[PDB]
Each structure stands twice: as structure tokens, then as C-alpha cells.
Symmetry: none
Subunit: 188 residues, 2 copies
């Protein structure tokens, strides 16, 4: 590939210090985020391409979905705090976008219960200051890269992936170009 | 049910002349479209309640899918041209969203071949003026109704279904409310 700023990636005007090496932002209301998760498996394929020691971080954003949007950011904080992201990502995406059965915080709670998280544990986490701090961390991270939309990925707080500039004829070629761009940027 | 403008349906500010009597839009990438068609069977339930003589039309759109999305819209034109919608809708939805076996146009072609459409016939239709025209027709219809998202349904180019307010405490009752609304608008 001939990597070029503006094509596969763009460069932040003011790089963020102490940023995660690979930082993804998403919303459970975001249609492309649904595709990135269920059909393209972007995070898994980026992980596979990168060295074993690279930290990948994934944060939820507030600006899709009204009040339920805020609740989902708090729920994603719960998931991070309990380490159950992989248990709830699909039923949260599908509950919001596919079946549209997630309408309130109670419905979000039911998803966690059905994914095996004990209700008492969910409630304790939901109300915890660990979770409150993770909510603040997600919001600050988005602010720091001046985030305007999702999905988004940032490498070393300097470079932003530009999927728009990639080939969309074949799903697996798209994923390969995306992951290979992350690898190129990571060792930049 | 007591029908009111703004409740079960809305009224287009700019009516579309010569529109199909009942016009549905969808995308094979769209999870709620999968829900509508593969789980709720909205098209089929609407059809069953429609007055005799009222035909249903269904067009594909491309909001998410880039070049592959365009391929899907052209493949849907082939399905319309060949009259094989009822043979390929299921394996196309499953292949895109569930088994992730549809990654490119070649995989779409394989679905038609497996459904009984010979490869040379699929290709002849793919490259036909009829299919080129059907692609233009799908695009133009979406533009005419100022299509914002999918799924969507329009009656007589005048009325837009509004499922948001409908009873969703029960997917069976939702389907009934939705199909009854189309029947009502068709009679108007
Ligand atoms: C994130 C993203 N992904 C796209 C896309 C990805 C894959 C494929 C395919 F190859 F799987 F078909 C198609 C489009 S556009 C797109 C995008 O434009 N995102 C933001 C700006 O609004």
C-alpha cells in the first residue's frame, strides 16, 4: 500500500499525551459500529495483526441515542469494570438496532442478567464510583481527540483511521486494509 | 385503531406521482430490515391484508455498504428482473448478516446460482439494460420520497408508515398494527 495522509488515515492537529496505543470509539446506536462488530469484526482483526503486547481500548460515546445513549455509556463502563464486554456487546447491539427491545436502563440491566451477570453485581457496579470514573474517562478521551462521530480509531493519540478512503468492494479486503493501516501507524 | 395523520403514518409534503401503490425500502446490511423481513415477515403480512389488485414493491438502498452495497442493489434489481425475490431474500440476508459468507459480489452470484438461477442467466441479467434501469429506478424512488433510513414503507407516494408509535409490547401485535395501517392507507 502507498500510505498517504488524507487517504488511509489523518493526523491530529494536537496529539494527545498518555493516549492508549490503540483507541476505538463506538456507540450501540451507530449503524457502522454494528457492522464493525458483527460482520467485519474490526477489533479482533486489528488485534490479530498487531504484536501481542499492544493495548487496545474501546470506549462508548454519548452523542447517539438520547437519554438511553448516556445510559449505554454507563453500561459500557459497567462492562469494562466487570470485564464482561464480550458477553454483552452483541445483545446490546441487537437490542438497540435489530429488535429495538432496549428502550430504558431497565432493559439494559436485563441484557446483563441474561448474559450471566448477577443482578446484585450489576447494580453495585452501576452505582459505583469506579464506574463513574470510567464514564468520565470515556468522555474525556473523546474530548481530547475532538471526536465528532463513530466508529473511530486513534493510534498513539496522533493518527485517526480513515475508512472512507479504503476499498469497500470486498468486506475482507476492507478489513485487511484497515488492520494493515493500524499496523503501519503503530510503528510510525 | 383510530387513524390520524402523525400517528400511525405521516404525510409527505411533496407527493410522488406514479409511485408504486405500496413501496418498501430495505438494505441487506440493515439489522432492523432483517428483523422486519426475516423475523416479523412485514412484507408478507402486509400483502396478506392488502385489497386484491394492490401490488407491493420493494427496493434496495445503499446507506451503509459502499461498493458492496451498490452490488447488492444491482443484485436486487436482478432478483426483480428474474422474479426470484422469494428465492434469494433469505439466503442474502443470512449470508450478509448471520453466516458472513457474503463478502463480495461473487458471493452474491453464488447465492443466485445455488437458488437455481444459472450463472450465465444471472450474468445476462446483471449486464442487461433492464437491470441498469431498475437500479436507476430504486435510486430515484428513494430520492423522491426523501428517504432518510430503512426500513421504510410508503403508500401511493403520499403516506409514510410510522412504526414508532405503534404497539411494540408484542411483536405479533406490532405486525398486526403495521399491516392494518397499510390496508387503511391503501383504501384512502
Ligand atoms: C466506518 C465506515 N465504514 C464503511 C464501509 C465499510 C465496509 C464496507 C464493506 F466492505 F464491508 F462492504 C462498506 C463500507 S463507510 C464508513 C464511514 O463513512 N464512517 C464515518 C463517516 O460518516
Amino acid at each position: 500500500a502507498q500510505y498517504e495522509d488524507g487517504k488511509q488515515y489523518t493526523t491530529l492537529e494536537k496529539p494527545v499525551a498518555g493516549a492508549p496505543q490503540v483507541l476505538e470509539f463506538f456507540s450501540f446506536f451507530c449503524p457502522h459500529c454494528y457492522q464493525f462488530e458483527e460482520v467485519l469484526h474490526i477489533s479482533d482483526n486489528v488485534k490479530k495483526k498487531l504484536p501481542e503486547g499492544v493495548k487496545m481500548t474501546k470506549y462508548h460515546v454519548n452523542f447517539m441515542g438520547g437519554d438511553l445513549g448516556k445510559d449505554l455509556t454507563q453500561a459500557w463502563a459497567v462492562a469494562m469494570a466487570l470485564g464482561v464486554e464480550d458477553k454483552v456487546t452483541v445483545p446490546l447491539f441487537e437490542g438497540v438496532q435489530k429488535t429495538q427491545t432496549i428502550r430504558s436502563a431497565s432493559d439494559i440491566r436485563d441484557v446483563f442478567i441474561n448474559a450471566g451477570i448477577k443482578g446484585e453485581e450489576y447494580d453495585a457496579a452501576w452505582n459505583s464510583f469506579v464506574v463513574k470514573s470510567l464514564v468520565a474517562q470515556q468522555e474525556k478521551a473523546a474530548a481530547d481527540v475532538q471526536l465528532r462521530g463513530v466508529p473511530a480509531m486513534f493510534v498513539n493519540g496522533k493518527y485517526q483511521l480513515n475508512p472512507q478512503g479504503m476499498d469497500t468492494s470486498n468486506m475482507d479486503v476492507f478489513v485487511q486494509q484497515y488492520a494493515d493501516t493500524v499496523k503501519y501507524l503503530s510503528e510510525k
